[PDB]
Design a binder for these strands. Structure first.
Lengths: 125, 125
RNA sequence: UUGCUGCUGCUGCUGCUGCU
RNA sequence: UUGCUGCUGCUGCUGCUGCU
Protein backbone atom coordinates (compact mmCIF):
# COMPACT_ATOMS: atom_id res chain seq x y z
CA UNK A 1 0.00 0.00 0.00
CA UNK A 2 1.23 3.52 -0.91
CA UNK A 3 -0.36 6.96 -0.42
CA UNK A 4 -1.38 8.25 -3.84
CA UNK A 5 -1.10 11.85 -5.01
CA UNK A 6 -4.66 11.57 -6.41
CA UNK A 7 -7.79 12.63 -4.69
CA UNK A 8 -10.26 10.96 -7.08
CA UNK A 9 -10.35 7.15 -7.76
CA UNK A 10 -9.48 5.59 -11.08
CA UNK A 11 -12.30 5.37 -13.67
CA UNK A 12 -10.69 3.17 -16.36
CA UNK A 13 -13.38 1.79 -18.64
CA UNK A 14 -13.72 -1.95 -19.04
CA UNK A 15 -13.10 -3.43 -22.46
CA UNK A 16 -16.85 -3.87 -22.94
CA UNK A 17 -17.64 -0.28 -22.02
CA UNK A 18 -14.90 0.92 -24.39
CA UNK A 19 -16.37 -1.29 -27.24
CA UNK A 20 -19.84 0.05 -26.59
CA UNK A 21 -18.59 3.63 -26.58
CA UNK A 22 -16.69 2.89 -29.91
CA UNK A 23 -19.97 1.50 -31.53
CA UNK A 24 -22.03 4.61 -30.57
CA UNK A 25 -19.46 7.39 -31.32
CA UNK A 26 -18.31 8.54 -34.74
CA UNK A 27 -14.66 9.35 -34.10
CA UNK A 28 -13.45 8.19 -30.72
CA UNK A 29 -10.03 9.88 -30.75
CA UNK A 30 -12.08 13.15 -31.02
CA UNK A 31 -14.57 12.07 -28.24
CA UNK A 32 -12.77 9.71 -25.81
CA UNK A 33 -14.38 8.69 -22.50
CA UNK A 34 -11.83 10.90 -20.73
CA UNK A 35 -8.08 11.39 -20.34
CA UNK A 36 -5.17 9.66 -18.64
CA UNK A 37 -2.65 11.24 -16.25
CA UNK A 38 0.16 9.92 -14.05
CA UNK A 39 2.60 11.12 -11.42
CA UNK A 40 6.02 9.31 -11.22
CA UNK A 41 8.40 9.76 -8.26
CA UNK A 42 11.68 7.92 -8.76
CA UNK A 43 10.52 4.52 -10.00
CA UNK A 44 7.03 4.56 -8.42
CA UNK A 45 4.18 5.66 -10.75
CA UNK A 46 0.52 6.37 -9.90
CA UNK A 47 -1.96 6.60 -12.79
CA UNK A 48 -5.55 7.61 -13.31
CA UNK A 49 -7.99 7.46 -16.17
CA UNK A 50 -10.67 10.11 -15.50
CA UNK A 51 -13.93 10.71 -17.30
CA UNK A 52 -14.25 14.13 -18.90
CA UNK A 53 -16.91 15.52 -21.18
CA UNK A 54 -15.54 19.02 -21.97
CA UNK A 55 -18.11 20.90 -19.86
CA UNK A 56 -17.14 23.43 -17.22
CA UNK A 57 -18.58 21.22 -14.46
CA UNK A 58 -16.50 18.25 -15.59
CA UNK A 59 -13.30 20.36 -16.09
CA UNK A 60 -13.68 21.67 -12.53
CA UNK A 61 -14.16 18.07 -11.16
CA UNK A 62 -11.04 16.63 -12.93
CA UNK A 63 -8.84 19.59 -12.14
CA UNK A 64 -9.55 18.56 -8.49
CA UNK A 65 -7.88 15.11 -9.02
CA UNK A 66 -4.56 16.29 -7.45
CA UNK A 67 -3.22 19.41 -5.82
CA UNK A 68 0.29 20.75 -4.91
CA UNK A 69 -0.35 19.54 -1.35
CA UNK A 70 -1.55 16.02 -2.30
CA UNK A 71 1.42 15.62 -4.69
CA UNK A 72 3.90 16.85 -2.07
CA UNK A 73 2.47 14.50 0.60
CA UNK A 74 2.71 11.50 -1.64
CA UNK A 75 6.12 12.42 -3.20
CA UNK A 76 7.83 13.19 0.18
CA UNK A 77 7.52 9.45 1.11
CA UNK A 78 10.31 8.86 -1.45
CA UNK A 79 12.60 11.95 -0.71
CA UNK A 80 16.01 11.96 0.95
CA UNK A 81 19.29 13.73 0.52
CA UNK A 82 19.76 12.96 -3.18
CA UNK A 83 17.23 14.35 -5.62
CA UNK A 84 14.98 11.87 -7.47
CA UNK A 85 13.21 12.53 -10.80
CA UNK A 86 9.59 13.53 -10.74
CA UNK A 87 7.26 13.51 -13.74
CA UNK A 88 3.66 14.40 -14.43
CA UNK A 89 2.16 13.19 -17.73
CA UNK A 90 -1.27 13.70 -19.20
CA UNK A 91 -2.64 12.46 -22.56
CA UNK A 92 -5.84 13.68 -24.17
CA UNK A 93 -6.99 13.32 -27.78
CA UNK A 94 -3.71 12.11 -29.16
CA UNK A 95 -1.49 14.76 -27.44
CA UNK A 96 0.74 14.03 -24.46
CA UNK A 97 2.32 16.61 -22.21
CA UNK A 98 4.96 15.64 -19.63
CA UNK A 99 6.39 18.03 -17.03
CA UNK A 100 9.53 16.74 -15.35
CA UNK A 101 12.55 17.63 -13.22
CA UNK A 102 14.21 16.83 -9.94
CA UNK A 103 12.39 16.74 -6.59
CA UNK A 104 13.89 20.05 -5.50
CA UNK A 105 11.78 21.62 -8.25
CA UNK A 106 8.50 19.83 -7.29
CA UNK A 107 6.53 23.03 -6.43
CA UNK A 108 7.32 24.44 -9.88
CA UNK A 109 6.61 21.13 -11.52
CA UNK A 110 3.09 21.21 -9.92
CA UNK A 111 2.50 24.77 -11.07
CA UNK A 112 3.42 23.92 -14.65
CA UNK A 113 1.57 20.56 -14.51
CA UNK A 114 -1.74 22.16 -13.42
CA UNK A 115 -1.51 24.80 -16.13
CA UNK A 116 -0.65 22.17 -18.77
CA UNK A 117 -3.59 20.05 -17.68
CA UNK A 118 -6.00 22.93 -17.91
CA UNK A 119 -4.79 24.09 -21.37
CA UNK A 120 -4.83 20.63 -22.78
CA UNK A 121 -8.28 19.75 -21.50
CA UNK A 122 -9.60 23.06 -22.91
CA UNK A 123 -7.92 22.75 -26.27
CA UNK A 124 -10.25 23.58 -29.19
CA UNK A 125 -11.04 20.26 -30.89
CA UNK B 1 21.58 19.95 -44.90
CA UNK B 2 17.99 19.99 -43.55
CA UNK B 3 15.42 22.80 -43.26
CA UNK B 4 15.04 23.62 -39.58
CA UNK B 5 11.78 24.51 -37.85
CA UNK B 6 13.60 27.42 -36.11
CA UNK B 7 13.67 30.96 -37.26
CA UNK B 8 16.44 32.18 -34.93
CA UNK B 9 20.02 30.72 -34.91
CA UNK B 10 21.48 28.78 -32.02
CA UNK B 11 23.09 30.83 -29.20
CA UNK B 12 24.77 28.07 -27.14
CA UNK B 13 27.35 29.62 -24.83
CA UNK B 14 30.93 28.47 -25.04
CA UNK B 15 32.43 26.76 -22.03
CA UNK B 16 34.37 29.94 -21.20
CA UNK B 17 31.30 32.15 -21.39
CA UNK B 18 29.40 29.69 -19.18
CA UNK B 19 32.32 29.72 -16.61
CA UNK B 20 32.38 33.50 -16.62
CA UNK B 21 28.63 33.70 -16.15
CA UNK B 22 28.94 31.12 -13.24
CA UNK B 23 31.67 33.31 -11.51
CA UNK B 24 29.55 36.52 -11.69
CA UNK B 25 26.09 35.07 -10.78
CA UNK B 26 24.97 33.87 -7.36
CA UNK B 27 22.72 30.96 -8.26
CA UNK B 28 22.92 29.99 -11.91
CA UNK B 29 20.03 27.50 -11.97
CA UNK B 30 17.89 30.55 -10.91
CA UNK B 31 19.54 32.88 -13.54
CA UNK B 32 20.71 30.79 -16.52
CA UNK B 33 21.89 32.44 -19.76
CA UNK B 34 18.67 31.25 -21.40
CA UNK B 35 16.69 28.07 -22.12
CA UNK B 36 16.93 25.07 -24.42
CA UNK B 37 14.23 23.76 -26.77
CA UNK B 38 14.07 21.09 -29.47
CA UNK B 39 11.72 19.77 -32.12
CA UNK B 40 12.00 16.00 -33.01
CA UNK B 41 10.31 14.51 -36.11
CA UNK B 42 10.75 10.75 -36.31
CA UNK B 43 14.45 10.32 -35.54
CA UNK B 44 15.61 13.80 -36.69
CA UNK B 45 16.00 16.40 -33.89
CA UNK B 46 16.69 20.15 -34.18
CA UNK B 47 17.79 22.00 -31.03
CA UNK B 48 18.34 25.56 -29.94
CA UNK B 49 19.77 27.25 -26.89
CA UNK B 50 18.33 30.79 -26.78
CA UNK B 51 19.27 33.68 -24.55
CA UNK B 52 16.47 34.97 -22.36
CA UNK B 53 16.50 37.52 -19.59
CA UNK B 54 12.86 37.44 -18.37
CA UNK B 55 11.92 40.84 -19.82
CA UNK B 56 8.93 41.36 -22.08
CA UNK B 57 11.20 42.32 -25.00
CA UNK B 58 13.22 39.12 -24.64
CA UNK B 59 10.09 36.91 -24.15
CA UNK B 60 8.64 38.35 -27.36
CA UNK B 61 11.96 37.68 -29.27
CA UNK B 62 12.25 34.00 -28.14
CA UNK B 63 8.59 33.23 -28.65
CA UNK B 64 9.39 34.12 -32.33
CA UNK B 65 11.94 31.22 -32.58
CA UNK B 66 9.37 28.90 -34.29
CA UNK B 67 5.81 29.12 -35.51
CA UNK B 68 3.10 26.58 -36.58
CA UNK B 69 4.05 27.33 -40.19
CA UNK B 70 7.84 26.94 -39.73
CA UNK B 71 7.31 23.67 -37.80
CA UNK B 72 4.91 22.32 -40.44
CA UNK B 73 7.32 23.21 -43.29
CA UNK B 74 10.21 21.49 -41.64
CA UNK B 75 8.21 18.45 -40.34
CA UNK B 76 6.45 17.76 -43.71
CA UNK B 77 9.88 16.81 -45.22
CA UNK B 78 9.60 13.61 -43.14
CA UNK B 79 5.80 12.80 -43.60
CA UNK B 80 4.26 9.97 -45.61
CA UNK B 81 1.40 7.56 -45.25
CA UNK B 82 2.33 6.22 -41.82
CA UNK B 83 2.35 8.62 -38.91
CA UNK B 84 5.70 9.43 -37.27
CA UNK B 85 6.18 10.72 -33.69
CA UNK B 86 6.69 14.41 -33.16
CA UNK B 87 7.96 16.01 -29.97
CA UNK B 88 8.66 19.50 -28.73
CA UNK B 89 10.72 19.86 -25.54
CA UNK B 90 11.78 22.92 -23.62
CA UNK B 91 13.83 23.13 -20.39
CA UNK B 92 14.17 26.23 -18.24
CA UNK B 93 15.35 26.53 -14.64
CA UNK B 94 15.33 22.84 -13.88
CA UNK B 95 11.84 22.11 -15.35
CA UNK B 96 11.29 20.31 -18.65
CA UNK B 97 8.05 20.21 -20.58
CA UNK B 98 7.60 17.89 -23.57
CA UNK B 99 4.56 17.92 -25.87
CA UNK B 100 4.31 14.87 -28.10
CA UNK B 101 2.06 12.81 -30.37
CA UNK B 102 1.77 11.56 -33.91
CA UNK B 103 2.18 13.76 -37.00
CA UNK B 104 -1.55 13.81 -37.66
CA UNK B 105 -1.84 15.85 -34.47
CA UNK B 106 0.98 18.34 -35.33
CA UNK B 107 -1.26 21.48 -35.40
CA UNK B 108 -2.46 20.69 -31.88
CA UNK B 109 1.03 19.82 -30.76
CA UNK B 110 2.16 23.34 -31.91
CA UNK B 111 -0.73 25.01 -30.11
CA UNK B 112 0.09 23.23 -26.86
CA UNK B 113 3.87 23.69 -27.36
CA UNK B 114 3.59 27.50 -27.77
CA UNK B 115 1.40 27.80 -24.69
CA UNK B 116 3.76 25.59 -22.66
CA UNK B 117 6.73 27.67 -23.76
CA UNK B 118 5.08 30.89 -22.76
CA UNK B 119 3.93 29.63 -19.31
CA UNK B 120 7.27 28.13 -18.52
CA UNK B 121 9.29 31.18 -19.53
CA UNK B 122 6.95 33.37 -17.44
CA UNK B 123 6.95 31.14 -14.39
CA UNK B 124 7.44 33.08 -11.12
CA UNK B 125 10.98 32.27 -9.95
C1' U C 1 -9.13 5.41 -28.81
C1' U C 2 -10.15 0.77 -22.08
C1' G C 3 -6.43 -2.08 -19.79
C1' C C 4 -2.30 -5.10 -20.40
C1' U C 5 2.10 -8.47 -22.84
C1' G C 6 6.24 -8.87 -26.00
C1' C C 7 9.27 -6.24 -29.93
C1' U C 8 11.22 -1.74 -32.19
C1' G C 9 13.02 3.36 -32.92
C1' C C 10 13.25 8.19 -30.74
C1' U C 11 12.79 11.57 -26.81
C1' G C 12 12.60 13.60 -21.79
C1' C C 13 13.88 13.25 -16.48
C1' U C 14 17.11 11.65 -12.15
C1' G C 15 21.82 9.82 -10.61
C1' C C 16 26.78 8.63 -11.92
C1' U C 17 31.46 9.41 -15.35
C1' G C 18 35.04 11.82 -18.40
C1' C C 19 36.11 15.91 -21.37
C1' U C 20 34.81 20.85 -23.03
C1' U D 1 23.53 25.35 -14.74
C1' U D 2 27.40 25.71 -22.01
C1' G D 3 28.27 21.64 -25.16
C1' C D 4 29.46 16.65 -25.55
C1' U D 5 31.08 10.96 -24.25
C1' G D 6 30.17 6.49 -21.69
C1' C D 7 27.03 4.03 -17.74
C1' U D 8 22.41 3.54 -14.98
C1' G D 9 17.14 3.68 -13.60
C1' C D 10 12.39 5.65 -14.93
C1' U D 11 9.04 8.00 -18.14
C1' G D 12 6.69 9.80 -22.68
C1' C D 13 5.90 9.40 -28.08
C1' U D 14 5.60 6.60 -32.97
C1' G D 15 5.24 1.89 -35.32
C1' C D 16 4.51 -3.30 -34.81
C1' U D 17 2.35 -7.87 -31.86
C1' G D 18 -0.92 -10.75 -28.86
C1' C D 19 -4.73 -10.71 -25.37
C1' U D 20 -8.53 -7.98 -22.76
Amino acid sequence: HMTSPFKLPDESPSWTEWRLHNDETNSNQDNPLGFKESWGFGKVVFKRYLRYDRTEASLHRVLGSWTGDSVNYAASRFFGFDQIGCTYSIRFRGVSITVSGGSRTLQHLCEMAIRSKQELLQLAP
